[PDB]
Design a protein around this nucleic acid. Structure first.
Lengths: 192, 213, 113, 243
RNA sequence: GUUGAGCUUGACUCUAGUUUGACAUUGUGAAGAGACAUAGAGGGUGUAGAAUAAGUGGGAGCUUCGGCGCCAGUGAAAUAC
RNA sequence: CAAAAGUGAUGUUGACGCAAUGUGAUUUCUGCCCAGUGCUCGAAUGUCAAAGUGAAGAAAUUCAACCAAGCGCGGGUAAACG
RNA sequence: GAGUCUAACGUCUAUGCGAGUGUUUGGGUAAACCAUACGCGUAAUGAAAGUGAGCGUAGGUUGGGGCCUCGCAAGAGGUGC
RNA sequence: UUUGUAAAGUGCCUUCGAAGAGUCGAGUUGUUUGGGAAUGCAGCUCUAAGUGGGUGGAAAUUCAUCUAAAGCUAAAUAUUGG
RNA sequence: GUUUGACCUCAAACAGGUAGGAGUACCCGCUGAACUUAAGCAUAUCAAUAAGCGGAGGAAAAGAAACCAACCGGGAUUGCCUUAGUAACGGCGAGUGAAGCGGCAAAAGCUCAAAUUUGAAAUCUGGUACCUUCGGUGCCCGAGUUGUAAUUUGGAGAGGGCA
């Protein structure tokens, strides 16, 4: 909208601003580690649409992911056998690398709970997602209906089961044709 | 080769006496090809005896060859005719059979006599390469004047080109477009890659310089 | 920063901050700056440099120049909001209604722009 | 087949030994850049053997607390380091046998021991006994220098290295041979590796692929190339010339 | 036994490994050497024949400074434009 | 040479050595071979992955299909096999 | 303690009731009685240019007749579903 | 009590509104037996619009139908240590 | 030199409350196999589960449309009876195998924006200063009303105020 200084850039990352800016902000992350804080967000436009009516307790952390695919050991000794798994970077799985970034900050800072994330580009080292985390004590947020549920105890580890947008894709949620079988949980229909 | 200046390279060329150097006679317009990337081999070699729909045009000095009622029909048109003995009579010397390749352009040979031609009259008609049309003994020779205009040679032989006439100053520019495009069509689409092989063509009048398209 | 396109001088940069009790009305905040613009309710826009993140302030040299007020860059935020007289340390501001300073305010705007 | 003996090299029980017992084998410490009359330079103290080398070494004092307690400064043994003569160092140093100093400061054709060769390593080449390298890459070798290392081959060096001028102390392994094999086994406990050896042809093709045949001989091949696996790659590794 | 394990060859199926090439992550000037598009531009022989002969077909160059397959002739192949 | 990768042995040894393989102190000596196969070496020269022909009107639209290495060939060599 | 309380198919015993009958969850007069969703042996066949067959009902051969198109109603081709 | 505060119904006057991008999916793979193969779904890497985009197992084309990429929610039901 | 301040990055000790563990079954998620069958046979298949680890609760766990029918019509999730071995896949070999429609049971619906760019009287919040004992006082981060509107573009559909 009016914020075509964030939005124009966030949707079209190909633009003259962010291919320069995320080069020096991925450089910033080559210094930093598993988790590291971010100020007010890099993309505060999508951040507010997820849920970032602020206050302290409403924080945002940039987190790394892994390399390889679904890695398993290398074939030492034999190589053949029944070759059900031959490669070191073999299968993928259901969950997106959003979830990977979200639970690395999620179990380190156990108090701060996972809301949802977005991508802030990458380099050749890892992909980087900015995870918005909420706080379950923080009020005004509890006086808001939009963030009441997330503070109360059932909505701890929303990523681990399937409440967060990424963990929805661990069960079966997108509205379409074959949503009939994969309606609820994946183990309810039992992998069909 | 384009379909763009197909009228224009006929039109302006044949219009002035600045580009083409107009002589005494009615300059007889042809179209030769320009077949680059063609190998004189098995495949790319075109030959035949086709004809263009408005007639390629040439006549000039016509010779007839026949016996009996073919000779009567010939000189009733006004064209002189050779018989069997007269066919031998050019062949028995140097000059007259090579001069048959020169200025004698259109030819008629009657039914039984066509199969006599390429034994005597043949090695002299290599370049230039004139040959009679299929005319029987029952055919009318006055109605076959337009057939010797129509039926032209097609031979690639040694070279790459296949020269055929399109018309002359007796035709207009409009008619000559529907002769030029007809020539190229025969060669082009039978051998793939097509128009990148067919290079830069110009319509020669007689005395008509380059005007390639 | 990569923010600053055309710049002003430091000595006149201070004089732009205290452009609140010398005109009449002032709005404060960088939302209320970009808000300012169409009907020309903003006259002088007070662009601070020091605003975190830098994504907020890159609106101001661009947006406010398209629809078009003659802006000018103040020296910093720490004595921007304090010189307006608000609560907090204001990230930007704009001069709305003029008091006596119109002729003086003309050489706050058009020095840089 | 089973696990080949050459694969059991990276880890193992035979690949453990005393590490911290070793007082300091022969690197080189900080020793003064300057020689503005010198700062960090002094005399030789004791003569002590570190395990690993199989040769005597020494202790040295400089300007800093070094007789006993501070455990680091071990000095390269040349004949005959002992109490009451000074060492000198620095860049444009005084060229003597028993002084540690640059390769740049020494002319062509000087013999040197305990010399670096990569960009800084403290001490690499010729630390034990008998050994020395030969610096002959100055003068028409203009910018980048070159130690011609003792076989025949290469090594490009930038500025690079310090080292002691001389041939090192000892000389009684090639100069004097041993007597028996249990006295040779004193090598393979200060170094971690299997010892001795049994023949490749005598071992089964199971345990090592050089076996095979009732009448014993070499099963696969003796010459195996450089790009090959673990059990695959044995014998003479790329026999460039035979004989 | 349409047996099991240890264990084998350049059979054949296939893989960790091994080896060569390409693309993204990842910026900036000179000098020297090519290709395409082509404004423009050319490298040749068998004898006789006025004379220095690869083509192709229409069919006809003897002069406002200046020919040799019109005619007429040589030849294996013979104009011009 | 180990490890999924981080990280190390080999190694604070260094060719006067480290290691795989062949081997055995002593003492006199060692003639001859390039077919076949491996390892190594070398450049005169040959092959392998990115077209375009066809459907809109009582018979007159559009877009997806060749270039490098080992090899061939040439050169070095038998404490690698013969 | 060594052919068996699952449970599918096909002859057959017994049988309320049959050219229409007989259900079930459940209601509920409670092992009763009422309801009747809906089933019941089930489609030929043409390498690529349809039809939907009465529980399911086709094949072989032939006559009459209705409809459409091209072309000179000369005649050719399906309609024989 | 009309609760000096929050919503709906009733009645009157006056005048005119929107969008969520690493997702849509993509060179290629894949959680799916990729087979012409929807969807569920995003490894390595990049990447799209709101009279515009999407579901309905090939495409041109037409008709009916829905409007994500933030989030929450009762029961019919499953089961035991006492 | 030297005088005066805001946000990113981003601490340690005193002092009210609050808590550890022992346990079974039920579910969701994740690293994630196999004995086996086609009498055998590497890719059908034992299977997304065991075993191990993680996550949520007293029920777990799901869900209110980027749906179906097919121009006649209807409108969440969940359980049961019809359905379905039909429609498909697999040496078409073991095997695996839906959807739609009618009936029965119990059936109510909601949180987020003109995005967002966000700041003050007051409301009002996370952290934290002085007072120095949860009572009184103060600042920044900030949420919408509000002080007060745009940006990038468009329509004739339809909304909002006031009582």
């Amino acid at each position: 909208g009016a914020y075509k200084y964030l939005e124009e850039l966030q949707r079209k990352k190909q633009s003259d601003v962010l291919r320069f800016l995320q080069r020096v902000r991925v450089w910033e992350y080559r210094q930093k580690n598993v988790i590291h804080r971010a100020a007010r967000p890099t993309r505060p436009d999508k951040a507010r649409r997820l849920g970032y009516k602020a206050k302290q307790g409403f924080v945002i952390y940039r987190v790394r992911v892994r390399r390889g695919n679904r890695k398993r050991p290398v074939p030492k000794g034999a190589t053949y056998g029944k070759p059900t798994n031959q490669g070191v970077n073999e299968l993928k799985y259901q969950r997106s690398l959003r979830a990977t970034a979200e639970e690395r900050v999620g179990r380190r800072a156990a108090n701060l709970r996972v809301l949802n994330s977005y991508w802030v580009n990458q380099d050749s080292t890892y992909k980087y997602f900015e995870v918005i985390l909420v706080d379950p004590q923080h009020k005004a947020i509890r006086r808001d209906a939009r963030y009441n549920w997330i503070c109360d105890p059932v909505h701890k580890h929303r990523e681990a089961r399937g409440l967060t947008a990424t963990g929805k894709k661990s069960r079966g949620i997108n509205k379409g044709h074959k949503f009939n079988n994969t309606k609820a949980g994946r183990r309810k229909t039992w992998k069909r | 080769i384009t379909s763009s200046q197909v009228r224009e390279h006929v039109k302006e060329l044949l219009k002035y006496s600045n580009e083409t150097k107009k002589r005494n006679f009615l300059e007889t317009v042809e179209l030769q090809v320009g077949l680059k990337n063609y190998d004189p081999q098995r495949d790319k070699r075109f030959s035949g005896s086709l004809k263009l729909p408005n007639c390629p045009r040439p006549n000039m000095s016509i010779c007839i060859f026949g016996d009996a009622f073919d000779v009567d029909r010939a000189k009733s048109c006004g064209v002189d005719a050779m018989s069997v003995d007269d066919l031998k009579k050019l062949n028995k010397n140097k000059k007259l059979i090579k001069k048959l390749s020169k200025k004698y352009n259109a030819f008629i040979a009657s039914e039984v006599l066509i199969k006599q031609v390429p034994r005597l009259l043949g090695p002299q008609l290599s370049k230039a390469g004139k040959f009679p049309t299929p005319v029987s003994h029952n055919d009318d020779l006055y109605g076959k004047v337009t057939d010797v205009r129509s039926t032209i040679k097609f031979q690639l032989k040694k070279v790459l080109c296949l020269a055929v006439a399109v018309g002359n100053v007796e035709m207009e520019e409009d008619v000559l477009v529907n002769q030029i495009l007809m020539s190229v069509n025969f060669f082009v689409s039978l051998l793939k890659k097509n128009w990148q092989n067919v290079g830069s063509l110009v319509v020669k009048s007689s005395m008509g310089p380059a005007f390639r398209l | 920063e990569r923010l600053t396109k055309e710049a002003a001088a430091v000595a006149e940069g201070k004089s732009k901050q205290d452009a609140s009790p010398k005109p009449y009305a002032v709005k404060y905040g960088l939302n209320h700056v970009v808000a300012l613009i169409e009907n020309k309710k903003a006259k002088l826009v007070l662009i601070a440099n020091d605003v975190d993140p830098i994504e907020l302030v890159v609106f101001l040299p661009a947006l406010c120049k398209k629809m078009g007020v003659p802006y000018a860059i103040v020296k910093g935020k720490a004595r921007l909001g304090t010189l307006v007289n608000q609560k907090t340390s204001a990230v930007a501001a704009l001069t709305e209604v003029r008091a006596e300073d119109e002729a003086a305010l003309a050489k706050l705007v058009s020095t840089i722009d | 087949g089973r696990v080949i003996r050459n694969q059991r090299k990276g880890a193992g029980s035979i690949f453990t030994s005393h590490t911290r017992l070793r007082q300091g084998a022969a690197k080189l410490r900080t020793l003064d850049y300057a020689e503005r009359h010198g700062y960090i330079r002094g005399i030789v103290k004791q003569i002590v053997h570190d395990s690993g080398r199989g040769a005597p070494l020494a202790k040295v004092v400089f300007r800093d607390p070094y007789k006993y307690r501070l455990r680091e400064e071990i000095f390269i043994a040349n004949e005959g380091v002992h109490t009451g003569q000074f060492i000198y160092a620095g860049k444009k140093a005084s060229l003597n046998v028993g002084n540690v100093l640059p390769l740049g400061s020494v002319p062509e054709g000087t013999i040197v021991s305990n010399v670096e060769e990569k960009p800084g390593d403290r001490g690499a080449l010729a630390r034990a006994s008998g050994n020395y390298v030969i610096i002959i890459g100055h003068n028409p070798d203009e910018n980048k220098t070159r130690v011609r290392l003792p076989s025949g081959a290469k090594k490009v060096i930038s500025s690079d290295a310090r080292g002691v001028i001389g041939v090192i102390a000892g000389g009684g392994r090639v100069d004097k041979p041993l007597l028996k094999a249990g006295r040779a086994f004193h090598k393979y406990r200060l170094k971690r590796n299997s010892w001795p050896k049994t023949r490749g042809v005598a071992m089964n093709p199971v345990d090592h692929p050089h076996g095979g045949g009732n009448h014993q001989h070499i099963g696969k091949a003796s010459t195996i190339s450089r790009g090959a696996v673990s059990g695959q790659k044995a014998g003479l590794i790329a026999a460039r010339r035979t004989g």
